[PDB]
């Protein structure tokens, strides 16, 4: 089950506490098709205390991927900044190269496999690149990048 | 049973969840002769969240094949784009060659056998080619291409 | 039993489903002398969804053979096209040669035996040739050609 | 049993693995009269990975010999090249001389006996010569050349 | 069994550890016909830590030989460099001479026997020469060169 | 097992205590592919108390060799100084000569054998030379130099 892989990977980087429970429920609802309103979800995310900016960027990215329900919605600066990590030459260089590989992919595992060859910083940078143009890659490839990013992150701790 | 082969192959590339169940039921009805209205089905497909564009193109292609019930209906750009994959020299080259072989076929297995020699990308590209001119090949050959495409895809994961 | 051979051969190329059942019943009635109205049957055939053009041509050919009940009826373009396969040099060449052999035959098995030496494409092409002039051969020879054509077809799958 | 000799000789030059099993089955079917479609078989052969070009040429040659089922089919460049070995003066000279001896033969063993006096390279070259004009020699002589070629090859390893 | 010889020779030069296990599995799959995607495999190879460049060149060469599945794929500079060893007059001279002998060969053992008369450095240099034009020799000869190269290498330790 | 040889040689020059245990674990992880971040490891090394500068240079050299994970990373002055030993004519002269021999090598044992003919001071000096241009020699040769250096050192005590 693909969506259960995303969910498990994403939750893995969130520290334990009541906030996590709330993130587990919202993720479950979005991945269940239980409607959703991007605008509302994002405000919520953007305002949660104790959540690392990066983790908000990863969640914001995931909610933007699924539950499109955008309707001309603009990109959230708070997602772009946490993803672009805001500065760090090099890593950005690796991000561009990964972005080029992912563009040739179509599947979740294919994207996930090649992505696992980069560090969390570059992976996050690459997510920031895709976020600028979500339609650059397929939804399955994007999801593959998300997990890898989360895998490398949880491994950092 | 031919139609059960298509159904099993097509469902295999859809990730688990309530959406799949809904796809399983619609496919069952179309393959049961339970009437159907292409126009309605396609709008539905075109608007499902979490379904990969490619998978919509494969489904859109299948619904166009069976349940003709078209009535002068035009080709759905959302099917053509997801199939033509939109860009990728080479693969398209293999697609043309496959298209030439399928044109000489008449049966499901014959078409399926030779098709299994190409990659998912080329197979999908070939489906895009047939979609432009559905009458290029027989319905059985087209169905053979669908399965192979699905087989190679599920094998990608 | 001759007519049971035709029936079994013809049904063998039709995929399973409720439509087949309906074809099994109509064939049974025609072969039972249960009257019939060519005009009505053909409209029905011509309008069935999911039936391959070829299979309609083979059925249309059989219904034209038996249950004459024509009454000056013209040839159905939808039968001629599905049979003539509409284009394919060569195969047509073999069709002509077969047509020449069948003209010397009088029996079902004689016609069936020599016919089994050609491919489905040529056999179908030959049926198209006979369809232009049904009286070219005897009804038993025509029936022999039908089975062989069906035998070679079901063997293609 | 002649055909069992060809089969054993041909398989002897194919390295072990699942591909061999598939070659063993197809050879068995062709030599069993189980119909066959040259065009289909050849595409398959032409596209198998890990099979040495030469071995494809030998198989392509054998399938062309038996299961004629050609129908005006042209010679496969991929068979001619692997056989003509594509360049090598001398050896070609021996090939011509062998070709002259085989033309006087009629039987399998006669052809096989004299053929065993040449090297694999010349034998393969000679097969290439016959392939240009299959009707140059009798089918039994051709089969004799195939085995010898295979015998000398397996002896090379 | 030829392919088991390649596998055993290739693994022999890889030091023990979990990485070897992963190489053993991928080699097994490629040699089993289990599809494969050259592009993907190579990226993987190119990015493995602790693998000596040379060993990557030997593996890259083997994967290029089998599982063609190239599709117009270009030569990997990381394979050419590790093979051409990048500089070393003389040895290159022996490589050219070996290249000339292998061109006259057709079998695995023939190529392997004569190859075993050169040192690992020259053998590797010769592999680099073939890599520039894979079609210079037959697949069996190439495989013979691979083993010898591996034999001489493992003997160096 | 190559990597176990490096590990045993490297640990042999570290005096007993809890610090060694920590070095044993980090070396084990790096040699296990357990990711790693050169930048982090080096800071750690650079800041350990009681470790002789030389031993840090040898470790820094090893971590730079494996777990490349550099990404444009610059050479660590603290590694260069401990290796170049910072001054000592002569020995440096032997280092250059060894550097010239190693450049002709490709394997671990070959490099290790010839290296064992020099003293620890020259060997260390030679490591300093390679460190300036890591790509001067193959990874296996470099590893051979490391052990010899460690062998000669532990023999000094």
Could you describe the largest sheet of chain A, including whether it forms a barrel?
none
CATH architecture annotation name of chain A: Orthogonal Bundle
Number of strands of chain A: 0
| Number of discrete domains of chain A | 1
- State the end-to-end CA separation of chain A: 26 Å
CATH topology assignment of chain A = Arc Repressor Mutant, subunit A
Query: Secondary-structure element order of chain A, as H and E?
Result: HHHHHHHHH
Beta-strand percent range of chain A: under 5%
Secondary structural class of chain A: mainly alpha
Output the radius of gyration of chain A. Answer: 14 Å
CATH class of chain A: Mainly Alpha
Shape of chain A: globular
Number of helices of chain A: 9
Q: Report the oligomer.
A: homohexamer
Most extensive chain contact?
E-F, 18 and 20 residues
Query: What is the percent of helical residues of chain A?
Result: 55-70%
What's the CATH superfamily of chain A, by name? Answer: Influenza matrix protein M1, N-terminal subdomain 2
PDB class: viral protein
Keywords: Viral matrix protein, pH Sensor, Polymer
Assembly: hexameric
Entry title: Arrangement of the matrix protein M1 in influenza A/Hong Kong/1/1968 VLPs (HA,NA,M1,M2)
């Amino acid at each position: 089950s693909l969506l259960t892989e995303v969910e498990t990977y994403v939750l893995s980087i969130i520290p334990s506490g009541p906030l996590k429970a709330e993130i587990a429920q919202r993720l479950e609802d979005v991945f269940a098709g239980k409607n959703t309103d991007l605008e509302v979800l994002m405000e919520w995310l953007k305002t949660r205390p104790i959540l690392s900016p990066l983790t908000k960027g990863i969640l914001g990215f995931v909610f933007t991927l699924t539950v499109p329900s955008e309707r001309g919605l603009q990109r959230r600066r708070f997602v772009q900044n946490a993803l672009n990590g805001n500065g760090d030459p090099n890593n950005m260089d690796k991000a561009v190269k990964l972005y080029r590989k992912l563009k040739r992919e179509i599947t979740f595992h294919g994207a996930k496999e090649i992505s696992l060859s980069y560090s969390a910083g570059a992976l996050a940078s690459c997510m920031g690149l895709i976020y600028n143009r979500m339609g650059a890659v397929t939804t399955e490839v994007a999801f593959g990048l998300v997990c890898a990013t989360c895998e490398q992150i949880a491994d950092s701790q």
